[PDB]
Amino acid sequence: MSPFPLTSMDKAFITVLEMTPVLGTEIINYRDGMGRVLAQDVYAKDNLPPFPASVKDGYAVRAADGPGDRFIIGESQAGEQPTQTVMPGQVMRVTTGAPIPCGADAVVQVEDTELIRESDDGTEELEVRILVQARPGQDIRPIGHDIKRGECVLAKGTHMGPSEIGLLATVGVTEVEVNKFPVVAVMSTGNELLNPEDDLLPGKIRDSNRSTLLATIQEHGYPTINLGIVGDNPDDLLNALNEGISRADVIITSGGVSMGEKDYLKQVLDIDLHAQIHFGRVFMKPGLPTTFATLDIDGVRKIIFALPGNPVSAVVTCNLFVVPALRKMQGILDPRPTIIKARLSCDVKLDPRPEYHRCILTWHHQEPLPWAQSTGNQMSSRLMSMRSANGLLMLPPKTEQYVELHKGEVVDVMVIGRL
Amino acid sequence: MSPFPLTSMDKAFITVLEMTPVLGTEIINYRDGMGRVLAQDVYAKDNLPPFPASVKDGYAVRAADGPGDRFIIGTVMPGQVMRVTTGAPIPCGADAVVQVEDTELIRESEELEVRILVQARPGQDIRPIGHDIKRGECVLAKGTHMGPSEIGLLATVGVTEVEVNKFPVVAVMSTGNELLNPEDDLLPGKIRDSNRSTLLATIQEHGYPTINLGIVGDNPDDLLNALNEGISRADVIITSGGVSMGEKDYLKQVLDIDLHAQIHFGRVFMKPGLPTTFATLDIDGVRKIIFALPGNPVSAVVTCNLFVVPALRKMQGILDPRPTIIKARLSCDVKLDPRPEYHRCILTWHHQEPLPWAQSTGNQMSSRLMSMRSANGLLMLPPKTEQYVELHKGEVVDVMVIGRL
């Protein structure tokens, strides 16, 4: 029974990626590019190195002239192009990374030039000690070596990290078109809720989901709006949802998603907002009452997650459904989260439905599979740790065979933190 | 020759840790707790839950009555029952489970009546007061590196102000008369400063405040001016400036002689990053740390990840600031180099295979293997030997994790 049917996890997820749209694009300074996804191809407009550059500190060694005693006509420096022209017989001193002049397919190495002399108060040193011809293409980085001009250095769809920001800087593309980040409105619903700042009154508890979700989404860098607590009443919900709709791309609620007097949210979404509820229940533990809706305004699509009020339910479903949704909204080609194999620390008896537990992944070095230790039963139990929950342990549903898992058994863990 | 002895990657890392301080504490709003390490035990004031609470949807029931057909009010008298939700409070005269699955309703008006199925157990599926958290109990210990769930806990117990270690402000500069800002268009003999950007990005990913000190000419006066600035204004100064060979002297000289910094090592046995240099400076009781990194752009990310980030993590109170190292397999053959080598790579799991695959992203040369995905880790290859000359596709290697997976 239920105005909404039980949706399987595999299906609930697929549904979220299908209905979640990619956001439009936007120009930003390459420094604000971390996390961003490139909406354009980026071509080089200069070579790198742009001048032949010296690999080591040495001289303008001709693999043509060879041994003969050379006239050191001066030094090539890192910051200037040599206003010189190494003619045959002579040689130019060059420090590592400095340009090479019109002389040779030169080189040296702090090894060969024994240095004959530096006459007249050793200011300059007009006497090079050259051995014999080394090998034409040895320690020179030719024009273009690292990057050629008009070369695409980063493709469209690249999810940018520090190296890419550096790469943009290398080629001087300081303004770049990227997918917008989604702005996320978060609210909590329920007459029992108080703010963390408040002192408990009878029958009430402090809202914790709102902080946990904002933090969860802030950790991925998406902007957020805190809509606060909202009563279990149609009017107040509608005003809140409307404000969220007007100021965000994704609205997240927590609380009141079951029975009848906690059924206003779904009723408000469908009846007063005319949103498309895609699923209202998913066969999972925790997160069964999890609801996902879409709403379209002037062509623009907005997405709505109504999450359970249960605190643990909240963080789990936010990680399973919201984050991947947001990763797509933001341009990531494969928005699915990474899942690794880990060994369980404790045996766990299975449940009819798939179980998700916050756990802590740890590599006990010099040993292949990480160990996954779960962080409690369904709360902060006796599990206290200096480390923060790191993965979501994903337990299969009970089969009439496979009824429970033992210590050491390989299990799938969805990574949810910086390892 | 060379003054500074060749230091192993091991001792270099240990020294950085040994000489790195742990920053002082500061009080923050709990919402600003991400990545922050508690500097106090946090105690709960109230009892969570503050009332007996339901576990799963269903009905509140009397233990005496047993199973049977009953009324749904909404006190609970003999013969009656109450409709109740997830974590909702339990009424008067109730004490049992009776969740929806074990119920089979009989009448409907609202709802007239319902029907329970077995023998109630005094206190079943009911969470007593303080079952989850009890008065004056320590929920989070001093030293806890907080994630989102820790912020949730703080909010739950109603502790909005918290004492945490300070985060380190880090200042960055580049040096070299060949560097222009990226904003600038090329001039003859010059190239764009890419390190400064990469380092700043790198440390920002970790959420520490950064300071862009800019390009400095390789001039003792200027150098000293920059160093002095970042020193007064930050806890850590990082610099790029090809520090070995020809004339790197400039920097170590200025450290040694003008600032009076203690240089702990100047060369490490690794590739890339041989010239990496590390120093401390004690000023009016306070200790600043200084990393002089090479100027090779591939050296930047590697050294910063190998030496800086672990320093910053100790500095903000993380008890074990060593990076996370995992085993993975090589996506392909790699020749070994006389010094132990570090390569950027992308870590990937292929459905139902226990270890992930480490695909390299080139040797140095700007961008070699193009991906729609950032480098995830640092491949940690051993040094070359007469007989141990290379590694094959499939072999197991250590991989340092430097990004989110």
Side-chain angles (χ1 to χ4, degrees), chain A residues 3-112 122 127 131-419, chain B residues 1-104 111 117-405:
Chain A
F4 304 86
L6 273 162
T7 301
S8 69
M9 179 58 206
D10 294 332
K11 172 148 206 181
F13 187 57
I14 286 164
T15 295
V16 172
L17 302 172
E18 281 183 333
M19 301 302 195
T20 292
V22 183
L23 291 166
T25 69
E26 177 203 39
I27 297 175
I28 70 168
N29 184 304
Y30 77 107
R31 289 166 226 145
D32 306 323
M34 288 283 289
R36 256 45 211 249
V37 169
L38 280 167
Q40 64 167 89
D41 269 24
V42 188
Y43 311 101
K45 48 164 194 152
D46 302 310
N47 292 290
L48 184 79
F51 41 86
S54 178
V55 168
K56 306 183 178 175
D57 57 343
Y59 302 66
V61 163
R62 280 204 186 196
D65 271 13
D69 20 12
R70 312 292 157 188
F71 306 85
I72 298 179
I73 73 167
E75 202 184 86
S76 184
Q77 302 177 27
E80 281 206 41
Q81 182 71 244
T83 301
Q84 288 282 20
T85 298
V86 165
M87 302 295 190
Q90 310 101 56
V91 148
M92 195 156 185
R93 193 59 152 93
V94 72
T95 61
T96 182
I100 297 180
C102 315
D105 59 15
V107 86
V108 152
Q109 288 169 31
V110 171
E111 300 193 47
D112 304 298
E127 279 184 42
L131 295 184
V132 175
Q133 306 179 1
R135 47 218 173 193
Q138 186 179 5
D139 308 331
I140 294 183
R141 254 152 26 75
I143 305 187
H145 187 247
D146 290 5
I147 303 169
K148 289 213 163 192
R149 179 162 162 166
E151 172 175 329
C152 188
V153 293
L154 302 176
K156 195 204 164 212
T158 308
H159 187 203
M160 227 112 96
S163 300
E164 291 64 56
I165 299 285
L167 224 187
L168 290 177
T170 300
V171 304
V173 175
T174 66
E175 293 298 323
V176 95
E177 189 173 7
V178 289
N179 283 95
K180 297 189 175 179
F181 273 182
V183 16
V184 195
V186 182
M187 50 177 288
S188 280
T189 60
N191 305 146
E192 76 285 12
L193 292 175
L194 290 170
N195 280 304
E197 300 73 32
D198 299 336
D199 287 355
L200 303 187
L201 287 175
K204 307 273 176 277
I205 67 161
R206 305 192 175 83
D207 180 14
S208 72
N209 291 182
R210 189 160 31 102
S211 304
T212 301
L213 302 169
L214 291 163
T216 293
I217 109 92
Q218 283 157 13
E219 184 177 2
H220 293 255
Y222 309 118
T224 56
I225 309 196
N226 186 313
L227 292 183
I229 294 162
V230 196
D232 279 323
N233 48 131
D235 267 327
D236 289 5
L237 277 159
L238 189 49
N239 286 136
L241 285 160
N242 277 333
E243 158 141 289
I245 286 155
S246 65
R247 282 148 57 29
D249 304 310
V250 173
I251 306 85
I252 303 194
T253 74
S254 197
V257 267
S258 289
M259 292 261 78
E261 265 53 303
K262 323 84 206 178
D263 198 3
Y264 291 113
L265 181 42
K266 288 171 157 73
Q267 152 173 130
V268 169
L269 289 179
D270 172 38
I271 297 174
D272 300 302
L273 282 185
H274 303 90
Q276 301 79 235
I277 303 187
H278 298 283
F279 55 83
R281 277 193 312 179
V282 15
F283 189 64
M284 63 186 304
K285 187 183 169 177
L288 183 31
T290 303
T291 303
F292 171 67
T294 62
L295 190 270
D296 290 308
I297 324 195
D298 293 62
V300 178
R301 166 165 295 188
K302 291 180 185 292
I303 67 169
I304 307 170
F305 297 90
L307 304 189
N310 177 97
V312 194
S313 279
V315 31
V316 173
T317 53
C318 182
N319 277 113
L320 288 158
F321 308 123
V322 181
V323 171
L326 302 183
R327 280 167 70 74
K328 191 205 169 174
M329 233 163 291
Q330 190 227 287
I332 306 185
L333 300 174
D334 186 355
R336 297 178 283 160
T338 302
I339 304 176
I340 75 185
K341 300 297 179 168
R343 298 190 191 265
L344 272 174
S345 308
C346 296
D347 314 52
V348 303
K349 189 160 87 162
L350 279 26
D351 188 291
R353 54 213 218 283
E355 266 272 22
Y356 303 85
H357 289 115
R358 288 176 301 205
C359 65
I360 293 167
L361 285 157
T362 142
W363 284 259
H364 293 246
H365 292 24
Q366 214 62 4
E367 160 161 337
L369 288 170
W371 284 87
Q373 179 167 7
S374 91
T375 65
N377 323 344
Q378 193 272 149
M379 60 209 65
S380 54
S381 57
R382 265 72 48 176
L383 185 137
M384 287 214 311
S385 168
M386 309 307 185
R387 263 139 41 71
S388 186
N390 207 176
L392 283 188
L393 185 51
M394 308 177 76
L395 299 171
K398 265 192 175 176
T399 293
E400 270 40 21
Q401 65 139 228
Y402 272 33
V403 138
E404 66 179 338
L405 266 23
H406 312 234
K407 155 186 289 303
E409 292 193 347
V410 175
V411 180
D412 297 338
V413 187
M414 178 185 297
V415 169
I416 65 171
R418 175 205 266 19
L419 286 181
Chain B
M1 226 305 168
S2 174
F4 298 97
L6 199 50
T7 302
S8 77
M9 226 308 282
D10 313 298
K11 170 179 161 199
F13 178 71
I14 289 169
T15 300
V16 171
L17 284 219
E18 284 179 352
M19 306 303 183
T20 294
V22 184
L23 293 178
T25 69
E26 153 199 29
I27 295 167
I28 69 180
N29 190 245
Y30 78 101
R31 304 191 194 93
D32 301 326
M34 289 288 300
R36 219 83 172 193
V37 166
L38 284 170
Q40 52 144 104
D41 291 356
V42 181
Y43 301 110
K45 297 170 195 159
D46 317 272
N47 293 289
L48 172 67
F51 41 80
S54 165
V55 172
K56 314 284 178 184
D57 277 340
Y59 304 97
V61 179
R62 186 88 158 75
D65 303 27
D69 206 300
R70 303 174 176 184
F71 305 136
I72 289 172
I73 198 157
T75 297
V76 180
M77 301 160 61
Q80 295 185 323
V81 145
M82 179 69 165
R83 186 165 170 169
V84 83
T85 322
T86 296
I90 280 58
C92 295
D95 42 300
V97 43
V98 195
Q99 47 183 333
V100 191
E101 297 88 352
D102 279 302
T103 289
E104 298 176 344
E111 298 172 341
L117 294 177
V118 198
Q119 307 162 16
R121 180 181 178 180
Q124 206 156 216
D125 288 36
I126 277 180
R127 295 195 184 183
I129 294 167
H131 184 249
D132 291 66
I133 301 166
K134 347 183 102 67
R135 272 263 301 327
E137 182 207 298
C138 181
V139 301
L140 293 163
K142 189 206 153 178
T144 294
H145 189 210
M146 302 180 309
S149 283
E150 285 65 58
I151 312 312
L153 226 206
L154 291 173
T156 285
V157 299
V159 181
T160 58
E161 298 308 321
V162 176
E163 185 182 342
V164 285
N165 290 80
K166 290 177 177 156
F167 258 10
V169 3
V170 183
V172 184
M173 53 182 278
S174 296
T175 78
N177 304 150
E178 71 286 355
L179 308 172
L180 300 162
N181 291 331
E183 297 73 22
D184 308 334
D185 197 356
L186 287 198
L187 286 180
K190 304 182 171 293
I191 66 185
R192 302 192 180 84
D193 185 11
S194 77
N195 292 190
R196 191 152 45 93
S197 279
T198 303
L199 292 181
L200 283 160
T202 297
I203 104 94
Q204 278 160 13
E205 168 160 355
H206 294 263
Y208 307 123
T210 48
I211 294 185
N212 201 333
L213 287 188
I215 313 307
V216 188
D218 228 66
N219 173 318
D221 322 28
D222 283 320
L223 253 294
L224 183 48
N225 288 154
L227 293 177
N228 271 311
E229 174 158 342
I231 279 162
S232 64
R233 184 145 96 98
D235 309 308
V236 172
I237 311 195
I238 305 185
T239 193
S240 282
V243 286
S244 65
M245 313 297 84
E247 225 152 51
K248 77 293 177 61
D249 299 3
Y250 283 105
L251 197 47
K252 305 198 190 180
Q253 185 210 238
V254 175
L255 284 182
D256 186 18
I257 309 173
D258 307 304
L259 290 165
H260 303 100
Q262 275 57 225
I263 300 170
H264 307 283
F265 60 78
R267 297 194 312 155
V268 16
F269 188 69
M270 70 198 278
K271 187 174 82 164
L274 179 308
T276 306
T277 283
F278 171 70
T280 65
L281 203 217
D282 299 326
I283 316 199
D284 277 46
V286 173
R287 164 171 283 191
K288 326 308 286 272
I289 62 165
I290 304 178
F291 295 83
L293 306 176
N296 189 119
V298 179
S299 299
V301 170
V302 167
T303 60
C304 184
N305 279 107
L306 284 155
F307 301 119
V308 180
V309 162
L312 306 186
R313 286 167 63 83
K314 175 160 97 172
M315 236 180 294
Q316 64 138 115
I318 300 181
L319 300 167
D320 176 11
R322 298 178 293 113
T324 304
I325 300 187
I326 79 191
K327 299 288 176 281
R329 346 228 322 258
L330 278 173
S331 304
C332 44
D333 287 13
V334 302
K335 285 171 178 170
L336 265 14
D337 172 282
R339 337 197 293 281
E341 195 161 359
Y342 297 76
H343 293 125
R344 278 135 72 196
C345 62
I346 299 178
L347 283 164
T348 318
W349 283 263
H350 291 254
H351 283 149
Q352 283 56 256
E353 291 201 16
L355 298 165
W357 293 87
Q359 326 265 317
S360 184
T361 58
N363 316 44
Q364 187 282 334
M365 314 202 58
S366 63
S367 53
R368 277 318 192 187
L369 177 144
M370 306 217 216
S371 187
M372 303 286 197
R373 196 136 84 76
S374 307
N376 231 349
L378 288 175
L379 200 53
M380 292 173 40
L381 302 171
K384 182 178 179 191
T385 297
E386 261 76 333
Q387 27 77 349
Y388 202 66
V389 163
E390 63 203 330
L391 271 37
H392 290 254
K393 180 182 182 187
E395 298 202 40
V396 175
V397 285
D398 290 333
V399 178
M400 174 164 312
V401 173
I402 67 195
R404 178 189 283 290
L405 318 188

